[PDB]
Design an enzyme around this catalytic site. Structure first.
Site, PDB file in Angstrom:
ATOM      1  N   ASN A 147     -16.808  -5.415  20.287  1.00 48.07           N
ATOM      2  CA  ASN A 147     -16.387  -4.087  20.724  1.00 48.07           C
ATOM      3  C   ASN A 147     -15.745  -4.056  22.109  1.00 48.07           C
ATOM      4  O   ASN A 147     -14.886  -3.220  22.366  1.00 48.07           O
ATOM      5  CB  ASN A 147     -17.576  -3.117  20.739  1.00 48.07           C
ATOM      6  CG  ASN A 147     -17.590  -2.175  19.545  1.00 48.07           C
ATOM      7  OD1 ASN A 147     -18.313  -1.181  19.541  1.00 48.07           O
ATOM      8  ND2 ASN A 147     -16.798  -2.488  18.525  1.00 48.07           N
ATOM      9  N   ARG A 200     -13.961 -10.166  10.747  1.00 44.16           N
ATOM     10  CA  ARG A 200     -15.006  -9.152  10.852  1.00 44.16           C
ATOM     11  C   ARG A 200     -15.927  -9.219   9.644  1.00 44.16           C
ATOM     12  O   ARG A 200     -17.139  -9.074   9.775  1.00 44.16           O
ATOM     13  CB  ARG A 200     -14.419  -7.742  10.971  1.00 44.16           C
ATOM     14  CG  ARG A 200     -13.607  -7.465  12.243  1.00 44.16           C
ATOM     15  CD  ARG A 200     -14.051  -8.301  13.441  1.00 44.16           C
ATOM     16  NE  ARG A 200     -15.481  -8.214  13.705  1.00 44.16           N
ATOM     17  CZ  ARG A 200     -16.147  -9.110  14.426  1.00 44.16           C
ATOM     18  NH1 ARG A 200     -15.503 -10.150  14.944  1.00 44.16           N
ATOM     19  NH2 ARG A 200     -17.449  -8.974  14.632  1.00 44.16           N
ATOM     20  N   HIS A 227     -10.392   5.784  16.277  1.00 45.13           N
ATOM     21  CA  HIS A 227     -11.671   5.755  16.949  1.00 45.13           C
ATOM     22  C   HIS A 227     -11.740   4.730  18.072  1.00 45.13           C
ATOM     23  O   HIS A 227     -12.169   5.056  19.176  1.00 45.13           O
ATOM     24  CB  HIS A 227     -12.784   5.465  15.965  1.00 45.13           C
ATOM     25  CG  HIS A 227     -14.126   5.368  16.612  1.00 45.13           C
ATOM     26  ND1 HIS A 227     -14.810   6.476  17.067  1.00 45.13           N
ATOM     27  CD2 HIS A 227     -14.870   4.293  16.963  1.00 45.13           C
ATOM     28  CE1 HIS A 227     -15.914   6.085  17.676  1.00 45.13           C
ATOM     29  NE2 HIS A 227     -15.974   4.765  17.626  1.00 45.13           N
TER      30      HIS A 227
END
Lengths: 272, 276
Positions: A42, A173, A251
């Site tokens: 992140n 991921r 986001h």
């Protein structure tokens, strides 16, 4: 996976994996809550920008990164905040700035309410911490199921410019989501009915109006997981707050808008 | 007076008082519409940050500063947009970023719609351009009457932290509102029924949705003249836009959040810099 793994320290009873870079004023980054998420996944683009002037602490919240997953751990807001305070005590950090992404933002707000003396400035990006009707997107995230196809699509939900969701990125991921015990603990946290969880992570309006912290709220206009309406609300509730919305942004404000984001955050903290 | 009076040039057939500092990429600063307003009065704290990297053009719109007020001029949105363009043609400026303050943001949007090839990046600060029910504040401002007391309250409306509104400031801006012909022209622009003017100054949702310009919308949460709600709409309508809202701040974002404001605006225009 490789660099997603940093240092290890016993925090509030659990062996925690984390990153400690830079020297000076402490700044803690709390990653979001998606499958395969980790402090490094992140924040690998943010950390560099801040460590030039601050000591960045980016840990993996209990049961998320490569941090131990206690045999019978009871996941809850209080638990995660106890973990955050655990890490701060282990590192002997009294006061620190907190940057929280969604799930991390809820925790940040929760932490600033329960341990005010340990929190300075806050940066809430598409943060949680206030009630809002579960979105199809969020449902997709918490409802994730291992599968390169599911991941790719999942990633599509976070981004605005699908062009950023490359096959490679999807594979990498996905790999993380299927690491030993990752999906295990993840699918055990936000089961089927979800509105509950969002409400459990939120803080009352009254409480939030208490927050004396200088705050920077960042949100992407097209955020598909956490609705803009949620930050606009925090922009009303929090007193010493600034609200910044990016257009044509999903986001992951810190990724799709790395430059603007790091510039706003670094300057925001330089004020102190 | 004094410092507010700067250079003089003829644009769109009218002597215009304006400021020109700095060099390089041009940025035009369009002031608001309160009594006594002037380009310098609105941007004197913003010009220094900008002059280091850009050529700053701060003009007084027709009938507002020390720019001539024609004997029968028909003040309208188009007439003002034409004045801006006039100013640009006079200084031989092809394209330029624009920063508009309320009334100025309205003119800025209009300009970017009618002369898309003359406007680069925009910064709408508590800008007009979208409809919104008139507010007691905007009303108190357009309905202003010369008087130190009247000015003090006008300023209290513009500011979140009344601690800024000192007697001195009130007295200075009052004298600014009573300069020969200033009040005479001000009071004849937004008479009693005012909703009209807000509407006339605005641009259709359709048109706004058209703008391709990179845009930075700034607004103060406690803005008592132009509602935060207006900027939020702009943030919805304009595609390539950012929206920045200051908490514990009045209308004049550039005055109560100067440093914060100058940084966003300078950094914003910097993103448009290509090398060599």
């Amino acid at each position: 996976a490789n660099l997603e793994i940093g240092k290890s320290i016993l925090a509030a009873g659990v062996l925690t994996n984390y990153h400690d870079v830079g020297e000076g004023q402490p700044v803690i980054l709390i990653h979001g809550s998606g499958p395969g998420v980790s402090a490094y996944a992140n924040w690998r683009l943010t950390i560099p920008a801040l460590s030039k002037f601050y000591r960045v602490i980016a840990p993996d919240m209990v049961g998320f990164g490569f941090t131990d997953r206690p045999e019978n751990y009871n996941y809850s807001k209080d638990s995660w905040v106890d973990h955050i305070i655990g890490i701060m005590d282990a590192l002997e950090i009294e006061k620190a700035h907190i940057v929280g992404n969604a799930f991390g933002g809820g925790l940040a707000i929760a932490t600033a309410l329960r341990y005010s003396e340990r929190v300075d400035r806050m940066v809430l990006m598409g943060a949680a911490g206030t009630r809002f009707d579960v979105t199809e997107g969020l449902n997709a995230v918490w409802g994730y199921t291992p599968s390169i196809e599911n991941m790719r699509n999942l990633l599509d939900i976070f981004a605005y410019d699908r062009s950023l969701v490359t096959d490679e990125l999807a594979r990498l991921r996905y790999e993380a989501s299927i690491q030993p015990g990752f999906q295990e603990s993840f699918s055990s946290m936000f089961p089927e009915p979800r509105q509950r969880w969002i409400d459990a992570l939120a803080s009352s309006d009254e409480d939030i109006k208490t927050l004396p912290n200088e705050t920077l709220i960042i949100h992407g206009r097209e955020d598909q997981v956490v609705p803009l309406s949620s930050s606009l609300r925090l922009g009303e509730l929090i007193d010493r707050a600034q609200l910044h919305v990016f257009g044509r942004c999903g986001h992951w404000t810190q990724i799709e808008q790395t430059d603007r984001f790091n510039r706003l955050v670094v300057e925001f903290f330089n004020e102190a």
